[PDB]
Write a protein that binds this ligand. Structure first.
Ligand code: BCL
Ligand code: BCL
Ligand code: BCL
Ligand code: BCL
Ligand code: BPH
Ligand code: MQ8
Ligand code: CRT
Ligand code: HEM
Ligand code: HEM
Ligand code: HEM
Ligand code: HEM
Ligand code: CA
Ligand code: CA
Ligand code: FE
Lengths: 258, 317, 40, 280, 319, 60, 60, 60
């Protein structure tokens, strides 16, 4: 790696042989690292790097072609995606600064609650049935011999107050497991789905603790179109709503601690 | 299998061997070091003698080495020896009830050699033993047969032909490793080249074998646990063979590696002819000497205990 | 299991004759070696 | 400059300390309290590391002082001072610089914390990163402390900190026999065995043979069920991995810690407890 | 069961999934799937069925010979005394043929069994590689796994095929032993001047480390985003989602840049597969091309310089 | 099988299939295990005395 | 023939697929574990005694 | 092929394709093995003895 060389040998004739392949592979990768996102949006802080450049060190790659399975469309990577929308205003005219959520941040659909418009279709299994469905349809699925049953437990909330009770849980045909919980909100008496990721258990009191949002927030949760299957579009917009709680369910959360 | 969590406690000893932050550091257990010293103590030297009167060869008829000395000194060197070798069986050990000069009991014969043996060490091999020296105690420590003596280890059991594989057994010889575990014979007893570290940048110069180095590693292990230290002591691991860097001790030990040979090749091996069965190994070879024999897990036998100095008969005349 | 008494006894029979097929072919095996190289 | 889907995520809040003040984005990075902190350590240390290359073992005019990235080295002070600050020249730099390492590593984690706090994501990453930092807190704090000398640390030299690994290693003879060390190693290997396996499968299902559709989790399971029988599971691997990774470091931390403070003899020998068992 | 997506709180079970339909010529899966509540509390509970065709059966039988041979000799040295066998297990091991045989076929005693059990373990892997190749195309899958497994195999053979044979001595080969093989790598290094200065050996570590690093990030990230369905990478690779939609922003804001849900897995691959790549090489060079990587480094001004507070003489030149 | 008469009861809780197969294994291993263990130190007809001569005599 | 009386009922709880398969394996490995260990033992036949060393004769 | 009569019934319970592959493979190893275990001991025919040393008339 020295600037000047006075020594030559086979050992070193192969080392550089690697770095070249390396410097090349790292680029190969970078190219791929841009099949989702780029180009960038603004110029808040002029692309930083040993060598600036227009759009990174490596020019964007060629659109790959993804043939979804039967009864499916087609995806291209990368792809020219139409600009999204921001339901928030700039906390400051200075670039980089954050964007304050308008109205109730719990549903402003921004940041934590913000979710992209995923395909308004539904994921399926190998054969063609909706991958993720409620046990009210999964005639084969049963609770593991021994493990306590969730169906019937009362879903508590952040503040502690009860928000509703589980009426059913959504299992996954493709990958045997519990992914959602058909929760029955008390307030709106509606039926919203609850994601495992946020679903906590207290087998002692037959509950499904949730620190995401308050019991009251469970009310206006992104409803589902068909109660016999969850759409990818909504599915992602579902558990995203809970995320908001992770940062909006309480002014204290977003507020500093020190 | 399982993971260690603390068989020894903090804070362990520390000894900075190399430049600041070179890795070369010695870490020793505090308590253990204590007990070692305590239980590993010498024996107060006997009262000085008149050193006058007649000479040994003068009155005593059958004396071949301690002649130079006088009577009181010689009578003294006779006492010391008995307390250091067979303080259990008295003088009758290397003699005959009455025949203070007979050479019927083998214990005497060897004692003669052993005498020259010691002397030599203190007189001609001073680069190793320094101005300190060794006495019959250093090896015998009060026992007719030195506890830490060795022999050509037979190895593992006989599968009826494919038994030669003598590297699969944790022998206390090599600090409980899985090496040949018998480097003492091929090295400490023989003279097999210990060096294998190529001295040239590229290949084609050193034909050393990979197994060979395993062997050296063997010996080194054993040596390491003999003096009871860590390779850092003698070297800087990134320069196992660069002496220009490695440590003064490294050389000091060098000589010993031969001082030991000497002790086996010109003293301990010849006496086998007279030594009995219980003193001979399975391969017919006699109990020889090793770094472990004297050092016995201490870089400096008896922690620099200077015994020989007070004994003039224990030096070449 | 997976069968009744009928199919069961039939198997056992043929299955035996096949086992004595071994013991005999192996015992005769041992013996042939026993004569050649005596162990013990 | 933001990604096609960045703007809708740059929300305000979720800060631990003095967030509103530094609550903003500089390019593709985030600052906040901890943001500025780390930086205050970066240059304050990165430059000192350079000052070391500048100065050298003895002096800037010496023949030792070099700039070869390989030969560059910043060794700690002697074991004499123990828990005392040695002259900036004779070990001082290392000591100070190291204090900047913790200020960079820890803060970097803390920074990640609230960063996740904004995305409402899980605090897995940081908690995971903790171990790495923890392992560091052992090779410079924990161990040295129970050894009574900040000089027990490792030199900050691209190749220099390898010798420190060779000596301390052989300091216990054949360092390959360390229980915790072995165990840990296994993990590092398992982990790599996991990546080579995970990453591979994904690319093998989303980019199948020519004229083939994107496989589903239906295949993934069968695939490893036909080569070895069982399939851990989708997120399962993402769990397993995370485990191995951390476990690899954890057991390692133990590996070096036990070496010295909890054991001075030679590791190869430690295994004797198994031998001296009244069963053989 | 602490839920940070660590342990599946509540499990459910469905009829044993007998894998997906395979092509013509591929034998039907075998083995009645099993269920484990505990195991399943970690990930998947169902077990099997497993495939086993020609290559498979030919493999499971092949390598199973080597293992036996090895474990055999091991229990042989202990004089078939299991007591001392389970005692010295770690130490026990099948040693390679003595240098007094070069590459020639030694007697079962002096190194024979090793070689035999070796070829049976060499092909056992080579064969197993095909076994995997047959499980990929049979499912229309690619060969990313074979490519990797290949790379690993590469370094595997470097320890016997390409290097030892290139040296002309079966002595330079790792032995069949838990502990003794640790000594092999222990000796090898000593024999070749300290692998710390061996270039490739370093590059390979960067991977043994990088590897651990990435998965620590990925494995984690996916979990942290497991809420927004971040585990279902497949449908994420096809049509990007919210999981991967924040999952990157994190890294981006943290380290500046980032990659895609798919992309990363590609890095991981090359960060792991390249591990052994720099492995077989670093060893393929040692013994043959270079003999002392220490002097080799300083030869190119690599080896750092340290003051001389300690130094030893040299009785050789002196005497 | 004298007092074993009452033991009849054991079958309802000690599953037949399992008990038989499993047990059949325990011996398989043990049988070898023992032969191996005795074959180790006690006496080794295979490599101890006669009629073995061809081994030693035949070799040299 | 004695025991063969009621031993037929065995297949009524133990599947034949089981025995047949395991049996082959055991008898296979087991067998190989004999010429093997015994081979390594004194009564070796390949290179122990006779054929008397011809290698030595023919080779040179 | 006499006993072949009663032996025919085996095909009705075990999948023929299995016993074939299991064996076509089982012999594969056994063969590669024997020449090996033998060539490594009794007579290393290839280069241990006869014929005319490739070393003597060779190397020189
Ligand atoms: C003679 C030498 C000995 C030996 C002596 C030692 C010694 C001595 C030690 C080890 C340690 C380790 N050895 Mg060992 N080891 C030997 C042979 C081996 C072999 C082998 C195949 O032969 C292997 C696989 C290992 C494996 C290992 C690891 C398990 C362990 C390192 C653990 C770790 O994860 O730290 C994880 C990481 C860290 C501590 C660093 C923290 C990372 C920080 C927070 C991030 C840095 C960011 C940076 C500033 C930014 C860079 C970006 C730039 C700006 C561009 N050793 C030989 C036998 N080994 C060490 C150990 O046990 O550690 C616990 C140790 O102290
Ligand atoms: C774990 C046990 C030992 C140890 C044992 C080893 C061994 C053994 C080896 C290394 C190797 C490396 N070690 Mg180390 N190392 C230790 C602790 C550290 C620490 C630390 C903060 O504690 C750091 C920053 C490093 C850094 C490094 C890298 C220079 C090098 C590449 C490793 C790698 O690819 O990881 C995977 C990760 C990445 C590729 C990404 C980020 C790492 C980057 C490339 C390294 C930047 C370091 C930089 C020079 C520090 C100054 C930054 C200034 C801003 C300029 N080590 C501890 C003390 N280390 C290898 C080497 O080749 O050394 C020469 C090697 O073989
Ligand atoms: C060491 C001194 C002697 C010696 C002393 C002994 C002694 C003493 C004994 C043996 C015994 C045995 N010895 Mg011996 N043996 C020697 C040298 C040898 C050598 C040799 C190469 O030198 C060999 C190959 C053997 C080989 C053998 C085995 C045949 C036998 C172990 C049977 C078993 O494990 O059943 C394991 C069991 C089972 C699988 C199942 C249980 C059996 C039931 C009752 C039947 C099965 C029922 C089933 C449910 C129905 C379905 C049928 C099928 C399973 C489908 N010996 C030397 C010379 N040997 C043992 C023996 O012969 O027992 C009769 C014994 O006690
Ligand atoms: C030890 C000193 C002697 C010696 C003594 C013996 C003795 C003693 C015996 C052998 C036996 C054997 N020896 Mg010998 N042998 C020596 C030297 C050799 C050498 C050599 C190169 O030097 C070789 C290659 C062999 C080779 C062999 C094997 C042919 C045979 C092992 C059979 C077996 O275990 O099947 C394993 C078993 C099975 C697969 C299953 C059981 C068989 C049943 C009956 C058939 C299966 C039925 C099935 C359900 C129907 C479907 C059919 C097909 C499977 C599709 N021997 C030396 C000279 N050898 C054994 C033997 O042949 O017994 C007959 C034996 O007892
Ligand atoms: C069990 C934990 C595993 C792990 C996980 C892990 N690492 C992580 C993370 C996680 C989860 C991050 O989130 C973070 C990251 O990459 O975030 C984007 C990171 C990271 N892991 C890194 C490195 C790293 N991890 C390692 C290991 C591991 N990382 C484990 C396998 C290793 C090694 C030795 O194997 C290295 C080298 C970094 C790339 C990055 C953290 C970067 C960071 O926070 O840097 C902060 C500080 C600076 C940029 C400035 C430093 C200047 C100081 C003033 C001086 C300090 C001197 C220094 C000590 C000298 C080093 C000299 C050496 C060359 C000898
Ligand atoms: C001698 C000489 C002439 C010198 C010239 C010197 C010159 C010109 C200098 C000027 C240039 C300068 C100053 C450059 C400075 C550049 C700097 C400081 C950069 C700092 C950033 C930094 C420290 C980055 C560290 C990055 C490292 C080491 C990462 C290690 C892990 C790794 C392989 C990451 C690459 C792949 C990525 C991005 C993984 C992260 C990642 C993971 C882990 C997911 O799981 C995941 C899941 C879903 C979507 C995305 C992701 C995702 O991106
Ligand atoms: C008795 O045993 C029973 C029945 C109870 C079963 C139990 C078995 C047990 C317990 C087995 C345990 C085995 C263990 C612990 C094995 C451990 C092995 C280890 C640690 C191995 C480590 C490293 C091994 C390496 C690197 C091996 C490399 C091998 C190579 C490269 C082989 C190459 C072979 C070649 C090239 C062959 C070429 C063919 C010829 C020679 C003909 O070409 C000229
Ligand atoms: C206190 C008890 C002992 C007494 C009184 C004693 C006395 C003597 C005397 C007087 C001599 C010289 C006499 C002669 O040869 O003419 C002598 C010689 C000798 N003694 Fe002792 N002795 C004692 C114990 C021992 C012991 C324990 C050993 C053995 C290790 C020993 C070994 C010898 C030897 C080897 C010689 C001959 C020395 C030579 O060759 O120069 N003695 N002893
Ligand atoms: C000058 C003082 C010494 C005397 C008088 C002496 C005396 C003896 C005697 C009498 C024996 C035979 C013991 C027996 O088996 O009955 C013996 C054996 C032996 N000595 Fe010494 N010895 C002395 C110094 C040493 C030293 C310094 C070493 C160490 C290297 C040593 C190593 C041995 C060994 C290895 C044996 C063989 C073991 C044995 O005989 O049981 N001796 N010594
Ligand atoms: C367990 C750690 C140790 C290891 C791995 C080790 C390794 C080695 C190696 C590989 C050599 C051969 C160098 C060459 O090719 O020239 C060697 C030589 C040597 N070592 Fe060590 N050593 C260790 C500990 C020690 C200790 C503690 C001492 C000091 C008492 C020591 C003293 C020597 C001497 C004197 C030589 C030169 C021998 C000769 O004349 O050939 N070593 N060591
Ligand atoms: C081949 C194995 C041996 C090795 C490697 C070895 C090595 C060493 C070393 C390195 C020292 C210096 C320790 C220090 O500086 O603190 C030393 C000192 C010493 N050794 Fe050995 N030695 C060996 C065998 C022996 C034997 C068999 C004896 C017994 C007669 C012995 C007696 C001594 C004595 C008396 C000292 C102290 C000298 C002093 O204070 O400087 N050594 N040995
Ligand atoms: Ca070995
Ligand atoms: Ca016999
Ligand atoms: Fe993944």
């Amino acid at each position: 790696s020295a600037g000047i060389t006075h020594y030559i040998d086979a050992a070193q004739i192969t080392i550089w042989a690697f770095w070249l392949f390396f410097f090349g592979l790292i680029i190969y990768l970078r190219r791929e690292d841009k099949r989702e996102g780029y180009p960038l949006d603004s110029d808040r802080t002029e692309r930083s790097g040993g060598r600036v450049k227009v759009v990174g060190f490596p020019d964007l790659p060629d659109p790959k072609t993804f043939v979804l399975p039967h009864n499916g469309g087609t995806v291209v990577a990368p792809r020219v995606e139409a600009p999204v929308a921001v339901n928030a205003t700039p906390f400051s005219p200075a670039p980089g600064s954050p964007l304050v959520p308008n109205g109730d941040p719990m549903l402003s659909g921004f940041g934590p609650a913000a979710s992209p418009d995923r395909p308004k279709h539904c994921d399926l299994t190998f054969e063609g049935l909706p991958k993720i469905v409620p046990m009210r349809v999964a005639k084969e699925f049963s609770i593991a011999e021994g493990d306590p049953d969730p169906r019937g437990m009362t879903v508590v909330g952040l503040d502690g107050e009860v928000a509703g009770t589980v009426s059913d849980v959504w299992v996954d045909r493709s990958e045997p497991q519990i992914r959602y919980l058909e929760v029955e909100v008390a307030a709106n008496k509606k039926k919203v789905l609850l994601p495992i990721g946020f679903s906590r258990f207290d087998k002692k009191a037959r509950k499904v603790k949730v620190d995401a949002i308050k019991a009251a927030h469970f009310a206006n949760v992104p409803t589902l179109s068909n109660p016999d299957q969850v759409t990818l579009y909504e599915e992602d917009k579902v558990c995203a709503y809970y995320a908001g709680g992770k940062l909006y369910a309480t002014a204290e959360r977003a507020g500093p601690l020190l | 299998s399982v993971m260690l969590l603390g068989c020894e406690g903090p804070p362990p000893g520390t000894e900075q061997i190399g430049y600041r932050g070179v890795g070369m550091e010695n870490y020793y257990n505090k308590r253990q070091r204590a007990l070692s010293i305590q239980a590993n103590q010498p024996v107060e030297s006997l009262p000085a003698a008149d050193s006058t009167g007649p000479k040994a060869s003068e009155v005593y008829q059958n004396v071949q080495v301690l002649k130079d000395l006088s009577v009181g000194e010689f009578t003294r060197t006779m006492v010391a020896v008995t307390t250091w070798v067979s303080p259990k069986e008295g003088c009758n050990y290397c003699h005959v009830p009455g025949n203070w000069a007979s050479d019927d009991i083998y214990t005497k014969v060897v004692s003669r050699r052993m005498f020259e043996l010691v002397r030599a060490a203190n007189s001609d091999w001073k680069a190793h033993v320094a101005e300190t020296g060794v006495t019959c105690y250093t090896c015998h420590r009060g026992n007719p047969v030195p506890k830490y003596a060795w022999v050509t280890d037979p190895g593992p059991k006989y599968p009826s032909g494919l038994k030669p594989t003598g590297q699969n057994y944790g022998s206390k010889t090599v600090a409980y490793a899985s090496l040949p575990f018998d480097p003492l014979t091929p090295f400490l007893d023989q003279a097999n080249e210990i060096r294998i570290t190529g001295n040239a940048a590229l290949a084609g110069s050193n034909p050393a074998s990979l197994k060979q180095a395993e062997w050296t590693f063997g010996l080194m292990m054993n040596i390491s646990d003999s003096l009871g230290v860590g390779c850092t002591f003698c070297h800087n691991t990134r320069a196992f063979n660069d002496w220009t860097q490695s440590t003064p001790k490294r050389t000091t030990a060098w000589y010993a590696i031969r001082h030991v040979r000497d002790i086996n090749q010109n003293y301990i091996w010849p006496l086998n002819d007279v030594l009995p069965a219980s003193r001979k190994g399975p391969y017919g070879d006699p109990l020889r000497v090793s770094c472990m024999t004297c050092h016995q897990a201490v870089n400096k036998p008896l922690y620099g205990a200077q015994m020989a100095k007070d004994y003039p008969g224990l030096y070449k005349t | 299991t997976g069968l009744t008494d009928d199919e069961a006894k039939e198997f056992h029979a043929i299955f035996m004759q096949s086992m004595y097929a071994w013991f005999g072919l192996v015992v005769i095996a041992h013996l042939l070696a026993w004569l050649y190289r005596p162990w013990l | 400059a933001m990604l096609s889907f960045e703007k809708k995520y740059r929300v305000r809040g979720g800060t631990l300390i003095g967030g509103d003040l530094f609550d903003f984005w500089v390019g593709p990075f985030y600052v906040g309290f901890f943001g500025v902190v780390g930086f205050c350590f970066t240059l304050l240390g990165v430059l000192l590391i350079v000052w070391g290359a500048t100065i050298g073992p003895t002096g800037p005019t010496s023949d030792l002082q070099t700039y070869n990235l390989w030969r560059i080295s910043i060794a700690p002070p002697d074991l004499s001072y123990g828990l005392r600050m040695a002259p900036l020249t004779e070990g001082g730099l290392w000591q100070i610089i190291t204090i900047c390492a913790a200020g960079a590593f820890i803060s970097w984690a803390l920074r990640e914390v609230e960063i996740c706090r904004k995305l409402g994501i899980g605090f897995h990453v940081p908690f995971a990163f903790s171990f790495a930092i923890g392992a560091y807190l052992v090779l410079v704090f924990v161990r040295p402390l129970l050894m009574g000398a900040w000089g027990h640390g490792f030199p900050y030299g691209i190749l220099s900190h390898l010798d420190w690994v060779s000596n301390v290693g052989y300091q216990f003879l054949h360092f390959h026999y360390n229980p915790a060390h072995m165990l840990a190693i296994s993990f590092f290997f398992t982990n790599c065995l996991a990546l080579s396996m995970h990453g591979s499968l994904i690319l093998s299902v989303t980019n199948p043979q020519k004229g083939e559709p994107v496989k589903t989790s239906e295949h993934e399971n069968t695939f490893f069920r036909d080569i070895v029988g069982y399939s851990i599971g989708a997120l399962a691997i993402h769990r397993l991995g995370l485990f191995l990774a951390l476990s690899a470091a954890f057991w390692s931390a133990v590996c070096i810690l036990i070496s010295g403070p909890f054991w001075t003899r030679g590791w190869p020998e430690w295994w004797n407890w198994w031998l001296e068992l009244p069963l053989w | 069961p602490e839920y940070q997506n660590i342990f599946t709180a509540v499990q459910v079970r469905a009829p044993a999934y007998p894998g997906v339909p395979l092509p013509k010529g591929n034998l039907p899966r075998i083995g009645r799937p099993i269920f484990s509540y505990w195991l399943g509390k970690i990930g998947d509970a169902q077990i099997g069925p497993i495939y086993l065709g020609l290559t498979g059966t030919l493999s499971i039988f092949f390598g199973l010979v080597a293992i036996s041979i090895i474990g055999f000799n091991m229990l042989a040295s202990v004089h078939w005394d299991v007591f001392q066998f389970l005692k010295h297990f770690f130490w026990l091991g099948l040693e390679p043929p003595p240098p007094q045989y070069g590459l020639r076929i030694p007697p079962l005693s002096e190194g024979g069994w090793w070689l035999m059990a070796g070829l049976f373990l060499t092909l056992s892997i080579l064969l197993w590689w095909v076994r995997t190749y047959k499980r990929a195309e049979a499912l229309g899958m690619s060969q990313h796994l074979s490519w990797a497994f290949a790379a690993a195999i590469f370094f595997y053979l470097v320890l016997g095929f390409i290097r030892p044979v290139m040296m002309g001595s079966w002595a330079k080969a790792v032995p069949f032993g838990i502990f003794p093989h640790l000594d092999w790598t222990a000796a090898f290094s000593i024999r070749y001047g300290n692998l710390y200065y061996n270039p490739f050996h370093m590059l390979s570590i960067a991977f043994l480390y990088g590897s651990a690093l990435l998965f620590a990030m990925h494995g984690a990230t996916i979990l942290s985003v497991s809420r927004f369905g971040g585990d279902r990478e497949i449908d994420q690779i096809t049509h990007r989602g919210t999981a991967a939609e924040r999952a990157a922003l994190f890294w981006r804001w943290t380290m500046g840049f980032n990659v895609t849900m798919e992309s990363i897995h590609r890095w991981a691959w090359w960060c792991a597969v390249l591990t052994v790549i720099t492995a077989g090489i670093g060893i393929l060079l040692s013994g043959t091309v270079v003999d002392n990587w220490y002097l080799w480094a300083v030869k190119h001004g690599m080896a750092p310089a340290y003051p001389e507070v300690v130094t030893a003489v040299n009785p050789y030149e002196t005497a | 099988f004298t007092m074993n008469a009452n033991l009849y009861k054991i079958w309802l809780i000690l599953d037949p299939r399992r008990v038989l197969v499993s047990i059949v294994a325990f011996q398989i291993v043990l049988g070898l295990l023992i032969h191996m263990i005795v074959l180790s130190t006690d006496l080794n007809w295979l490599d101890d005395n006669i009629p073995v001569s061809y081994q030693a005599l035949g070799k040299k």
